[PDB]
A paper describes a structure:
By performing a comprehensive bioinformatical screen, followed by biochemical and structural characterization of interesting candidates, we were able to identify active members of this family in a wide range of eukaryotic species and a few host-associated bacteria.
In order to gain insight into the functional differences of bacterial VTDs in comparison to their relatives from viruses and transposons, the structure of Wc-VTD1 was solved in the unbound form at 1.8 Å resolution as well as in a covalent complex with [name] at 1.9 Å resolution. Helix α9 (residues 474 to 486) and its preceding loop (residues 469 to 476) are pushed about 9 Å toward the active site by [name]’s loop consisting of residues 7 to 11, where it offers an interaction surface for the Ile-36 patch of the S1 [name]. The β-hairpin turn consisting of residues 421 to 423 is pushed away by about 2 Å from the active site cleft by [name]’s four very C-terminal residues. To compare the [name] interaction of Wc-VTD1 to viral VTDs, a superposition of the bacterial protease with M48 was created, yielding an RMSD of 1.76 Å over 1113 atoms. Wc-VTD1 does not contain the [name]-interacting β-hairpin of its viral relatives, but rather an irregular loop comprising residues 380–386 (colored yellow Fig. 5a). While the F384A and A392G mutants showed some residual activity, cleavage was completely abrogated by the L481A mutation, demonstrating the importance of the Ile36-patch recognition.
Numbering used by the authors:
A (entry chain B): 1 to 75
B (entry chain A): 280 to 354, 360 to 493
The structure:
C-alpha cells in the first residue's frame, strides 16, 4: 500500500509499505530516498511521535495516510 | 563610578565578548559546545539587568559554559544536555495546531514561521517573562532571551565571522532580520531533504530559571 511523508521543509515523498512494517523499516525507506538517518527522524501522526519498535498497524496508519517528518536538529 | 564601568546593554545595542580562544570549539558544528554555551547564556541572562551585560559577562558565559561542556564530556534534557546542570527548567512550547508538532517536542518551524513562533513566545499567556528560547539548526545554536518589556536579547556564540560572541538588543522586526541572517535560506541543486531540513528548519526549546 502507499503512504505519504511530508517534510517540514515542504517535500511530499511516496512510500510503498505494508501494515506489518515497523516504524524503523519506514525510516529506513525514507533514508533510501532523502538520506536522513533514522535516529534523527521524528515521524509524527495524529500528534504523536512514532516509536521505532511499533508497526504501521499498531498506529492504525492506513493506505494513503500522510505522516509528517521533522528532523531532530543537533545544533 | 560611571566613567569606570564597562560598556553594557544599558547604553548600547550590541556587546561583544573579549575572549576568542574558544572560537575553534564554539564554531565546530561537529561538537555540541555551542549548545552548552547557549544554555549557559540562558542561565546567566535570564536574571541579568542590562547594565550587567558587558564584555566581561559574555566572557563569563564562555568560560563557565566551556567548563560545563567539559564536565559533561567526562563520564530533563535539551539536545542531550541535562537542564539541571544550568539550573534551568523546560517549559512546554510547540505549534499546537500544526501537523509537525507533538506534545513534549520542541517548537518546529522554518524561517517562514519564525515570526509566528515569536508572537506566541512573547505572549505572557503562553510563557512567563523572562523566558529564553534555545534555537537550533543542523549547524548552529542561538539563545533568544525574551525580556520583561517583551523585547529580546539575541545571544550568538558564533560571533561575526565566527569570531567571539555577542549579544544584541532587538525589537521584533530586528530579531526577525537577524535570524534571517544567521539562519539564511539555503539552497543548491540536488539538495536532499536531509540538508533542506538541516539548513532550513529550526527547533526551539523554552527554558526558564
Amino acid at each position: 500500500m502507499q503512504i505519504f511523508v511530508k517534510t517540514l521543509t515542504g517535500k511530499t515523498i511516496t512510500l510503498e509499505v505494508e501494515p506489518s512494517d515497523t516504524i524503523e523499516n519506514v525510516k529506513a525507506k525514507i533514508q533510501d530516498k532523502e538520506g536522513i538517518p533514522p535516529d534523527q527522524q521524528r515521524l509524527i501522526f495524529a500528534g504523536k511521535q512514532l516509536e521505532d519498535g511499533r508497526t504501521l498497524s499498531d498506529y492504525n496508519i492506513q493506505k494513503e495516510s500522510t505522516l509528517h517528518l521533522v528532523l531532530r536538529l543537533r545544533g | 563610578m560611571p566613567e569606570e564601568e564597562q560598556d553594557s546593554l544599558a547604553a548600547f545595542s550590541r556587546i561583544e565578548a573579549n575572549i576568542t580562544q574558544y572560537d575553534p570549539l564554539l564554531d565546530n558544528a561537529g561538537k555540541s559546545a555551542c549548545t552548552c554555551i547557549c544554555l549557559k547564556a540562558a542561565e546567566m541572562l535570564l536574571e541579568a539587568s542590562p547594565d550587567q551585560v558587558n564584555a566581561g559577562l559574555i566572557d563569563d558565559i564562555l568560560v563557565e559554559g566551556v567548563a560545563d561542556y567539559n564536565r559533561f564530556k567526562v563520564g530533563t534534557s535539551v539536545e542531550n544536555y541535562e537542564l539541571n546542570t544550568f539550573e534551568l527548567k523546560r517549559l512546554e512550547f510547540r505549534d499546537v495546531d500544526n501537523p509537525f508538532s507533538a506534545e513534549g517536542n520542541p517548537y518546529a518551524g522554518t524561517l517562514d514561521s519564525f515570526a509566528k513562533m515569536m508572537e506566541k513566545a512573547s505572549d505572557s499567556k503562553d510563557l512567563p517573562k523572562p523566558v529564553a528560547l534555545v534555537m537550533t539548526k543542523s549547524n548552529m545554536t542561538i539563545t533568544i532571551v525574551i525580556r520583561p518589556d517583551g523585547k529580546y536579547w539575541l545571544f550568538d556564540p558564533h560571533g561575526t565571522n565566527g569570531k567571539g560572541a555577542y549579544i544584541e538588543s532587538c525589537n521584533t522586526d530586528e530579531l526577525i532580520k537577524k535570524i534571517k541572517e544567521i539562519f539564511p535560506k539555503t539552497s543548491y541543486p540536488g539538495m536532499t531533504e536531509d540538508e533542506n531540513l538541516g539548513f532550513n528548519s529550526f527547533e526551539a526549546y523554552a527554558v526558564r530559571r
